[PDB]
Symmetry: C3
Subunit: 129 residues, 3 copies
């Protein structure tokens, strides 16, 4: 059964403008090299990191959206609890830590990432038996 | 003096439908046996656990409602910080952990639980000298 | 560059009425002596602690306001992660702990506190290179 669905679009130029700025959440998610590389809006790193950010948001949307009219239970640092990793061929998967890992124990997170020009996007479908 | 008041109603059938499903907060509050037993909407466990859930919500309401127009300070995992225990005769009391235990140090939590047919309910009155 | 700006006003009488009451966040920020002293609305402690509270709120406003249309990431216990200390001559500065310390690494927090009659106020300007 489907637990939740989420989609997110990210402006790659806006992302690049912010990703290496002090006073943002991004140090908690990304390395200083990643953040420096991603601060150029036409780089590989910007495109890829923006799509990773998109994927985190799509997961958060997918789970939160499953709890209509319920007080939120996602921790304030949720962005650093959801990691998008890739295998050697670039296939993505989501790794979790903290409370969300316990909430989504026994749930499969299907994710896909894409980018084009100034736009990155991701979709997440949460599925459980 | 009264610090806060809260009341919550819970649909026992809706509760039973959700309590043992993956992708919910319930594993953090309830044991797998409790969750399995409570997944039948006409069982003892469903009625009792639904009323416990109701009591957690009534406590949260009672305290949050005391802070009108203030940014919330309840942690995301607040549901697992409030436990409803009973003595050998079924009398309920509330046990706290985390920040809410510190906030409600020196406050007495008066609680009552009830159920009937497809409905559980609880009321909480927080009192302090 | 400016990361954020915040301003807060605090009613010193309302603050004094609440600061030493059970069932409030204040034990986490202030000592029992501070809280007892500050519970008289015409005392030095009330005026000073109200302005410290104002400063915490101004910092929170300054940073949160920098994230228009973004899900909040400040932890529920944010008030106890922001401390206003003073040097021997009463000049204030802000000390941080927890996630906000990481978010505001490399950001300078300029703060000022004031009080008059029944009103305390503070302003925070967050600046980053
Ligand atoms: Br949520
Ligand atoms: Br974070
Ligand atoms: Br990531
Ligand atoms: Br609250
Ligand atoms: Br929880
Ligand atoms: Br419980
Ligand atoms: Br925020
Ligand atoms: Br706090
Ligand atoms: Br302080
Ligand atoms: Cl959006
Ligand atoms: Cl964007
Ligand atoms: Cl940010
Ligand atoms: Cl970094
Ligand atoms: Cl591999
Ligand atoms: Cl993909
Ligand atoms: Cl309700
Ligand atoms: Cl319900
Ligand atoms: Cl849930
Ligand atoms: Cl369980
Ligand atoms: Cl007993
Ligand atoms: Cl009772
Ligand atoms: Cl305000
Ligand atoms: Cl006020
Ligand atoms: Cl409070
Ligand atoms: Cl105290
Ligand atoms: Cl939180
Ligand atoms: Cl000094
Ligand atoms: Cl000053
Ligand atoms: Na997939
Ligand atoms: Na996929
Ligand atoms: Na009672
Ligand atoms: Na009772
Ligand atoms: Na300054
Ligand atoms: Na100053």
């Amino acid at each position: 059964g489907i637990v939740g669905v989420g989609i997110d679009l990210v402006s790659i130029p806006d992302f690049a403008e912010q990703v290496d700025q002090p006073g943002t959440v991004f140090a908690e998610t990304f390395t200083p090299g990643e953040r420096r590389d991603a601060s150029d809006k036409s780089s590989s790193a910007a495109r890829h990191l923006a799509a990773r950010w998109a994927a985190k948001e799509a997961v958060i949307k997918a789970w939160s959206g499953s709890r209509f009219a319920q007080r939120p239970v996602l921790p304030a640092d949720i962005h650093r609890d959801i990691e998008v990793v890739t295998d050697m061929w670039g296939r993505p998967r989501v790794r979790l830590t903290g409370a969300i890992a316990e909430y989504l124990a026994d749930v499969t997170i299907h994710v896909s990432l894409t980018h084009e020009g100034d736009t990155a996007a991701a979709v997440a479908i949460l599925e459980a038996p």
